[PDB]
Amino acid sequence: SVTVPNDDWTLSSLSETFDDGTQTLQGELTLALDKLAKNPSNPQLLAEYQSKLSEYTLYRNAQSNTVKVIKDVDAAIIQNFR
Amino acid sequence: SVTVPNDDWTLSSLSETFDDGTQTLQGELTLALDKLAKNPSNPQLLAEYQSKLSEYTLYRNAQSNTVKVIKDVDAAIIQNFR
Amino acid sequence: SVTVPNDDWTLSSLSETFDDGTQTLQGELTLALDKLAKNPSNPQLLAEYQSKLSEYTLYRNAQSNTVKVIKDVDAAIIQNFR
Amino acid sequence: SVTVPNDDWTLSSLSETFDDGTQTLQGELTLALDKLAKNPSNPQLLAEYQSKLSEYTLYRNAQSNTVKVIKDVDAAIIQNFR
Amino acid sequence: SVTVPNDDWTLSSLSETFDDGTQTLQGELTLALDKLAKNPSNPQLLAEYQSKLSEYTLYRNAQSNTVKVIKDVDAAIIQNFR
Amino acid sequence: SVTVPNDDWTLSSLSETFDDGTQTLQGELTLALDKLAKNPSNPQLLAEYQSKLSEYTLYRNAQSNTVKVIKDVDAAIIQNFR
Amino acid sequence: SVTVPNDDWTLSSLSETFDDGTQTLQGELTLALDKLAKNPSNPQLLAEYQSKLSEYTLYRNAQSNTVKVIKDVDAAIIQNFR
Amino acid sequence: SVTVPNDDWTLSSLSETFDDGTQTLQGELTLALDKLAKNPSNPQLLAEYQSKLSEYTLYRNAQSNTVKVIKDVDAAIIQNFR
Amino acid sequence: SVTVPNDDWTLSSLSETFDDGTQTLQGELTLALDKLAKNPSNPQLLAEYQSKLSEYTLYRNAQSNTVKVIKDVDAAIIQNFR
Amino acid sequence: SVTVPNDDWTLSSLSETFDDGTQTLQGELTLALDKLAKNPSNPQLLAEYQSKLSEYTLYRNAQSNTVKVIKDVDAAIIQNFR
Amino acid sequence: SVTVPNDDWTLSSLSETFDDGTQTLQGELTLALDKLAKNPSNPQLLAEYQSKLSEYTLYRNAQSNTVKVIKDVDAAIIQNFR
Amino acid sequence: SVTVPNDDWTLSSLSETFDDGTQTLQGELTLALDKLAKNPSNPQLLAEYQSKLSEYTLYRNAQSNTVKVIKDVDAAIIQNFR
Amino acid sequence: SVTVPNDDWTLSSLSETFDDGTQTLQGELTLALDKLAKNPSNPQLLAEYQSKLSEYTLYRNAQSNTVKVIKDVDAAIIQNFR
Amino acid sequence: SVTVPNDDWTLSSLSETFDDGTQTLQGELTLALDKLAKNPSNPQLLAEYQSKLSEYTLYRNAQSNTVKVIKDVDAAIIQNFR
Amino acid sequence: SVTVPNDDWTLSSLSETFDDGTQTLQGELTLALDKLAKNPSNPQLLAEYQSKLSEYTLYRNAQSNTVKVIKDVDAAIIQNFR
Amino acid sequence: SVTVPNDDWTLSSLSETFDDGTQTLQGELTLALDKLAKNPSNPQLLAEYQSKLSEYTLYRNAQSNTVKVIKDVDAAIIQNFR
Amino acid sequence: SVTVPNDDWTLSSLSETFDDGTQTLQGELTLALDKLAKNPSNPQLLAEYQSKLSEYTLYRNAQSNTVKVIKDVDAAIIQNFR
Amino acid sequence: SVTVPNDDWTLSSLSETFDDGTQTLQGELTLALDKLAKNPSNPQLLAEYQSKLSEYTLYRNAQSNTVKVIKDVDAAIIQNFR
Amino acid sequence: SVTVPNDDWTLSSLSETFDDGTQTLQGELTLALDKLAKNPSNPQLLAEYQSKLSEYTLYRNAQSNTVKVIKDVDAAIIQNFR
Amino acid sequence: SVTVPNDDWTLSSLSETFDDGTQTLQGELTLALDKLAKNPSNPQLLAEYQSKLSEYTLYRNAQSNTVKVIKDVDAAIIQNFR
Amino acid sequence: SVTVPNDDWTLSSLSETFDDGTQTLQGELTLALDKLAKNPSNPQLLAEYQSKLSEYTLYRNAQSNTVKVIKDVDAAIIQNFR
Amino acid sequence: SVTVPNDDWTLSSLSETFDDGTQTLQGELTLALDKLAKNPSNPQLLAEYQSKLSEYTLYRNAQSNTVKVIKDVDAAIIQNFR
Numbered sequence A, B, C, D, E, F, G, H, I, J, K, L, M, N, O, P, Q, R, S, T, U, V: 001s002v003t004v005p006n007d008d009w010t011l012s013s014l015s016e017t018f019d020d021g022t023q024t025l026q027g028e029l030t031l032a033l034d035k036l037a038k039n040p041s042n043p044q045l046l047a048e049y050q051s052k053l054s055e056y057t058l059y060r061n062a063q064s065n066t067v068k069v070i071k072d073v074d075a076a077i078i079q080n081f082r
Helices: A003-038 A043-049 A066-081 B003-038 B043-049 B066-081 C003-038 C043-049 C066-081 D003-038 D043-049 D066-081 E003-038 E043-049 E066-081 F003-038 F043-049 F066-081 G003-038 G043-049 G066-081 H003-038 H043-049 H066-081 I003-038 I043-049 I066-081 J003-038 J043-049 J066-081 K003-038 K043-049 K066-081 L003-038 L043-049 L066-081 M003-038 M043-049 M066-081 N003-038 N043-049 N066-081 O003-038 O043-049 O066-081 P003-038 P043-049 P066-081 Q003-038 Q043-049 Q066-081 R003-038 R043-049 R066-081 S003-038 S043-049 S066-081 T003-038 T043-049 T066-081 U003-038 U043-049 U066-081 V003-038 V043-049 V066-081
Strands: none
Touching: A003 A043, A003 A066, A003 B003, A003 D003, A003 E003, A003 T003, A003 V003, A003 V066, A043 T066, A066 B003, A066 E043, B003 B043, B003 B066, B003 C003, B003 D003, B003 H003, B003 T003, B043 H066, B066 C003, B066 D043, C003 C043, C003 C066, C003 G003, C003 H003, C043 G066, D003 D043, D003 D066, D003 E003, D003 E066, E003 E043, E003 E066, E003 F003, E003 I003, E003 I066, E003 V003, E066 F043, F003 F043, F003 F066, F003 I003, F003 J003, F003 J066, G003 G043, G003 G066, G003 H003, G003 H066, G003 K003, G003 L003, G003 M003, G043 L066, G066 M003, H003 H043, H003 H066, H003 K003, H003 T003, H003 T066, H043 K066, I003 I043, I003 I066, I003 J003, I003 U003, I003 U066, I003 V003, I043 V066, I066 J043, J003 J043, J003 J066, J003 R003, J003 S003, J003 S066, J003 U003, J066 R043, K003 K043, K003 K066, K003 L003, K066 L003, L003 L043, L003 L066, L003 M003, L003 N003, L003 O003, L043 O066, L066 N003, M003 M043, M003 M066, M003 N003, M043 N066, N003 N043, N003 N066, N003 O003, N003 P003, N003 Q003, N043 P066, N066 Q003, O003 O043, O003 O066, O003 P003, O066 P003, P003 P043, P003 P066, P003 Q003, P003 R003, P003 S003, P043 S066, P066 R003, Q003 Q043, Q003 Q066, Q003 R003, Q043 R066, R003 R043, R003 R066, R003 S003, S003 S043, S003 S066, S003 U003, S043 U066, T003 T043, T003 T066, U003 U043, U003 U066, V003 V043, V003 V066
């Protein structure tokens, strides 16, 4: 009915956000990676550069965790499932 | 008689609402889940993220309670029975 | 004679109404129940949700009183007896 | 006599209702089917999607039970016989 | 009778939804396709880009499965048959 | 007698439905036609756009079959004859 | 008779409206409350925020008067009695 | 009925706003905190940095009052209850 | 119906993006070309300057592949078809 | 009867869509035209700029085909006739 | 609703400006102070160095009036209140 | 009936606008105030800063007229009464 | 004889109407009452809300005159006596 | 008889419309009033704002003519008398 | 309605521009004035320094025409009226 | 009947559009006026600035034709009459 | 004899019809009157609104001819005499 | 007899439709007129704007043919005569 | 309807772009002119300075072709017509 | 929803600033260190060179406090958490 | 749309660079030429003075290759075309 | 959608940075190389001149490592992939 397309609408929008967030993550990923290379001097950038991301605790570093970066996008649809 | 289809009509509409509400719940579910992941920083979102839902007291968190989310849809028809 | 089928007619119609009213009650029952769940926020809906029904005084809440809801239909035929 | 057409009238109306209910069932059937496809995410819809229908207990799912959906219409006339 | 146009009404609406969903799928299809081309960098988008769609399990990728995208619209009327 | 106007009544109503269905068909016809033009991209819409209508099997496409669309209205009265 | 279900119908609809109005009031209530918190700067919002509601004179502020907000729903059925 | 999903809709939207406001608060929180650290020189920033927030009177400083920042989000749903 | 303009809307927006991306590609194209000429010294820029673009693998060089640059815009509408 | 205004309603809505689509076409027309002038550099835009529109195959270019653009609006009512 | 976050947005931006202006004032403050010390020779710089600031009339000298400099930032939020 | 919630709907929306306008006024108020302070140099800003607002004639200056700014919000509901 | 049941028939029907009218009055009563509360703004509704009912002259307001509303039903049987 | 409740029905419905129209007028009234205040700039809105309403000739401005706005509702029942 | 805040939005933005332009004029004013003083040598700067501004013909010199500079800001709102 | 409020609805909406268009015209009016003043250099803007508006032929310039701008709003209601 | 009550019966029924027709006329009268007021725009409604009624030729307008409306009821009994 | 009011009923309903259609025509009339003015650019709208209406062939343009628009309403009653 | 303001919106935006492009052209025009005067040495700048602009082929030189520069703005609205 | 990417946006920007500040700190760090080595003569530079940084009180010396310099970057994300 | 001015912006900037590079080339050209004349002694300067410029291989000597120097500027726009 | 061009934007900017950094590296490369040749005396410059670059540890010497210098640019896009 009307109801159905609602879900499509919501899902569509929702999925949209997910992609955006991930892509945003991608964007950051570029930045993060660049920084370390750019400025070797400060190890911290590197430290940030490589890390795991716990959601709350950690600062996600896209480059550091390949899985994380990839994970979000694929994850997101799973999240959609959730 | 006329009467019968009335029930069908009512039931149909009523059931319709239930699905909608649940789906709406689903929609929120997506949002809720996303938020926590999106913003690790604020634990509250997470706090909201995971909780039980009492109907009145609690704010339902779809993701937090899988059972809750699922529960509503199946519940609803039961509610129809009620 | 003619007279007899009159009673059948009347009774039939009358019974018809009873079922309708009850069913209507059922329909409301669905609505009422849904509302409380739907909107936890307003306790009043819940308050309405659970109550006894005096005929005059009370607002009947089908869900609140299982007996009431059931009662009407069975009652109605009794009423027919009355 | 007069009496005869009464039965025709009643039967006609009665049959009418049956068709309506079934058709209504058909209508729901469309909705139900659509929902699952539409929203894969919530398994419940699927769960509802496939089930048997006991009259009282179960929520009938037209698509799930082909026999059920078909059954009602043909059944109804049988019911008329009843 | 009245009943007939009901089916037409329902069917009409129902069919309407189907088209909408499919079209929505089309809309997503455009987005999905674009994304991969747009951002080569993240393979995931591509991964999403090409996949089969199980209804529940999979995330449907319109572009990936031509059949899927087409399938829904034609399917939908079949669904109407269902 | 009374009987006669009954037929008129029935016929009138019945004819009414027929017109409605056809008109409904007309309404769909507009939609169907529009869709294909509107969205060239999905051939399916076009595919639907042009087809024969078997009653059961086919999805009727008003625009595709001029005869079909016209057919129903004129047919309907014939149906009345039937 | 017919008459009876009429009352049920009317009452049902009428009650429906009442709930809607109240709920609407609830909706506003959320808005009203939010505004004051949101914008501390303008005291007026606060002023509106807290007030009594005379029906005609006053602008009802749900949050300001808890009793008012609650009052309407329960009141409404009383109104039904009226 | 229709009415129910209305509440869901309203609530959903309303809740949405709350999250936004809080998040906005979060955003400011980041800014506020940064400023003080960034510019030690002007104590005022610090002064702003730490304070209580009365709603009207005070300028809320997220960092200064941890409780405040957290409070809003959780509060908001409570507000929803209100 | 409503549905139709939806497609137009989506298509319009979608097409819009495509043009933007291509144009963006154009913009880059200008930059890329300029760089090589500007800085002969670093062959890499030239190397980048001329290449094929695989979507994922390659870095697209607009100038290097005339076809690629042109391709996207025309392609995009095709993509719209897809 | 009721039936008649139905057609008016449908027709009205349907016609509404047509105008919208055409107007949308107009809107695109403005964009399309502008682009070519704006960016001479990319011939493709021009190429798109001038073309015939087959419905499926071609990308319609309003400016390129004056007839096409005009055609749709006038056509649409004809389509209404269809 | 939407409306609420608007205020947050506006307020956020507005507050942002205030801080900027003040900070700018701070920046000038540094310059102003430096100048006098730097160039003792020209008393005017000193004269400028110390003064009250009327908004219109006076040239504000941050260093001269400690209160003024501080005043703006704290003032600004008050201004926000205004 | 239906009618009632219409008023609620209208009123709700209407009230919504009023708040928005006022808030907008608030937003401007912030800007206006800031400007004068920011740029003492141009008296005009100040001139604008302080003035009465006739509706048509005058340019309203929120800060200049406290009453005006406040007035609108409270006024608006009165306007609602009107 | 035959004659007697005639009176019963007539009386029964007649009484039926009376109840209906009164109930109808009741229905209006609900509406009328609701309106005033619903829309405080227009005093007229209130004005209508409270009034006496002359039969011809006045518009009866059930809520305004309790006696009137009650009066009709009891009156009606008296009317039957008349 | 049957006839009587017919009048009640008609009157009820008819009265319903009147209220609706008036209320609608009220709704417009809010809009109209708002506009002038909102946009002082265009005197026309004001011009519209204040005017008499001839039924045919004039555009009714609720706010401009208090009597008019009020008039309709009270008038309507008179109209009912008519 | 929605419409109203549109005007506010537009007006707000529009007014914003006006202020900006004027302020820009102010900025130029500073520059212009400075130049003449700075470089006495070239009379032209002075010549530019003092002049009337026709809109098209003349180059506006803020300092030269006090009225002009002031005029724009106040004018602008008038322009808003226009 | 139902029919009446339909006209009100339509008229209301229709009138709404008119105001919007006019207001939009107003908005443009502001822009148009500003441009000429802003950029004296290009006479064309001025040329556009002052002109008559034929509906089709001319580009309407609100400022140029006072009558035109005013005309639309008042006209619109006349148009409503049409 | 039997014969007498026949006349009473016939007369009673006949009179009944007359009242109904007149009342129906009354009902239309309400509608007719409303329409003109409701839609000033179309003079035709007004034209219809005021007219004489020849029986065959004219369309009776109750409101237009007070005498006509009244006339029918009183007339009817006269007609009974006829 | 019964028969008579039947005609009244039918006529009443039938007339009702006519008015509706005409009014609908009126509604379209508003739209049609608006469009041309709104969008001068597309002559087609104008072309549609002015035309004769053959019933089948032509698309009726209310504004274009004053007579047509008026004609329908008055015509309709004539049609009733037919 | 809604549709109309859409065109206004689109047109408004579209026109906006045109002005921008032209103005941009104006901006370039200033630059281009300046360059030649500034650097007599390189004839190329002059060569660029004076030329015709074919859209694709030529590089437009505003100063060189007065008509071109002017042309765009006026043209643009024509383009709007297109 | 929209909301989510907002946080990403804000966070992204916010994080960006943090890095910048830290990096800026790094830049200063280089300068500070260099100075002392460069100019042994003035101990003050050295004194500045080595110190703790309280935020307000102290002048941070990156080199002096290794922890401080490092601290900011890592801290910043923590700050983000804050 | 927005998109268009983007191209203008990009193109404008891009073109800007080209001119700059060429001009820079011009600047070098002056230097290069001067050097040879200035220092006859070192033939190398002369050798550099006259040469062809391959982009990568050669060091461009503006004076040596007149065509080269000129070429870049004109070329650049061509490059823009590219 | 919007989202797509975001990536393009980000990527474009990001890529821009990479080129800049590399080019910067190129610039340094020139300096570094020059220094050693310029000042043979200090071997350190030479030592710096030739080295490997670890990112953190080493100071990159463009000339020393040809691969490094080249590597960055090509690498960067790879980094983009990352």
